[PDB]
Every structure is written in C-alpha cells, then in structure tokens.
Design a protein around this ligand. Sequence first.
Ligand SMILES: *[C@@H]1O[C@H](CO)[C@@H](O[C@@H]2O[C@H](CO)[C@@H](O[C@@H]3O[C@H](CO)[C@@H](O)[C@H](O)[C@@H]3O)[C@H](O)[C@H]2NC(C)=O)[C@H](O)[C@H]1NC(C)=O
Ligand SMILES: *[C@@H]1O[C@H](CO)[C@@H](O)[C@H](O)[C@H]1NC(C)=O
Lengths: 97, 96
Amino acid sequence: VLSFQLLNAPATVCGPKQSTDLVKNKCVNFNFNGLTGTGVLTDSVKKFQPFQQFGRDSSDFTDSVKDPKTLEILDITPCSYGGVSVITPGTNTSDAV
Amino acid sequence: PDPAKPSKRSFIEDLLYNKVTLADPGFMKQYGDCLGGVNARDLICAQKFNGLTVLPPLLTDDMIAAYTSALVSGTALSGYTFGAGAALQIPFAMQM
Ligand SMILES: *[C@@H]1O[C@H](CO)[C@@H](O[C@@H]2O[C@H](CO)[C@@H](O[C@@H]3O[C@H](CO)[C@@H](O)[C@H](O)[C@@H]3O)[C@H](O)[C@H]2NC(C)=O)[C@H](O)[C@H]1NC(C)=O
Ligand SMILES: *[C@@H]1O[C@H](CO)[C@@H](O)[C@H](O)[C@H]1NC(C)=O
C-alpha cells in the first residue's frame, strides 16, 4: 500500500521530467513541481519564510512561486489585465473602428 | 467661484468635496501600480485580476460645477424668468 500527500509541503519524490530553463517577459505555460499555470514572469522582490513553495492570495489565485533550481521567488501575472473598448459607427456606415 | 484661483468651484463646494472621501479615483492604474510591479495586494488590483472594472462618469467634476455656477449667476441677474424663457434683467433689491 502506497500513501502520499500532494501540494502541502516541499517535495522529495518527483516524476521523470526534464527542465527547459526559464523564459522571461512572456506569458507562457509553466509547470513547477506539478503546478500548471499561465502568465508573465519577469522578476520578484517579495520576501517570505522558508518551507514555502507557492504564493497564495485572498482569492486563492497564485501570484508568486519559488524556483526549485535557482532558489529564488518569481511572480505570476495574467496575460490580460486591462480593459479594451471598441467604438464603431455601424455596419452600414463603415468598417473602420 | 473665486476668480483668484481657477478652481471652477465655490468655497462651500470645496468643503463638500473634501468632507466625503472616495474609494479609488482616477482610474489610471498601470503596471508597477499593480502586482506587475510592487504592492501590498490592494483591493483595486485584485478586482482587475478577475475581470471587474469601474468605468468613469461621462461628466467630469469641473463640468458639473459649471452648471451650478451658471444656475447661481442666473438667479442673481434674472430671478426665475430665465427658466421660462429668455433672461430679464432686474435689480436684486426689487427682485427680492
Ligand atoms: C541542481 O540543483 C543544485 C542544488 O541542489 C544547484 O547547484 C548550483 O549549481 C549552479 C550551476 O550553475 C552553481 O552556480 C555556479 O556557481 C559558481 C558561482 O561562482 C560558478 O561556477 C557559475 O557561474 C554558476 O553560477 C551553484 O553554485 C550551485 N549551488 C551550490 C553549489 O550550492 C543547481 O542549480 C542545479 N543544477 C544545474 C542547474 O545544473
Ligand atoms: C443597411 O443598409 C441597407 C441598404 O439598402 C438597408 O436596406 C438596411 O435596412 C440597412 N440595415 C440596417 C440594419 O439598418
């Protein structure tokens, strides 16, 4: 019988997967110790305590994470942040917006 | 309004505006002012992270005060005749 816990404490046993370095200033799909997500990652200055692997929020939305290879905190921000509005003069009128 | 400073508001209106506060004015918050830069996780940036946005009103504060300035000035020059048509000049002592 095998028993294990997931995503509560730093991990010691992981699957057979290889890393593909770090990409910056792009909203991409990352996977940190089995944590799929999407967003931009540029740099982080947040200070936290040890025995931590994820950054939570009041809305349970991830925003920071610790890189297990470089031992430094990162930041997560959604690829879309602002609002966009489009003004049109009507279909018959024209097509420029 | 006092012509000494172009505030476009009267003395009482400034006190009224300063007495009551607002949640978040401006609606001009960019990266660096949200978690893309550095914050203490302000409520406004959390709202925008979930598709919640607040739109500014069509009329600005300065434009609204212009209507009040026109209304008050019109009373001192015509009373209430301008409301039913064109303005009619009259001394204030006789108007009162
Ligand atoms: C695997 O994880 C280990 C920790 O378990 C990491 O060890 C670190 O390896 C890097 C390789 O770049 C070392 O950085 C190097 O250090 C000196 C700085 O003078 C220099 O040789 C290079 O410029 C480079 O920066 C780092 O010191 C080392 N940490 C230690 C020894 O405590 C490692 O990141 C991971 N292995 C990889 C990515 O191959
Ligand atoms: C658009 O233009 C056509 C041109 O004849 C007109 O008949 C039609 O009613 C217009 N459509 C709308 C939705 O106003």
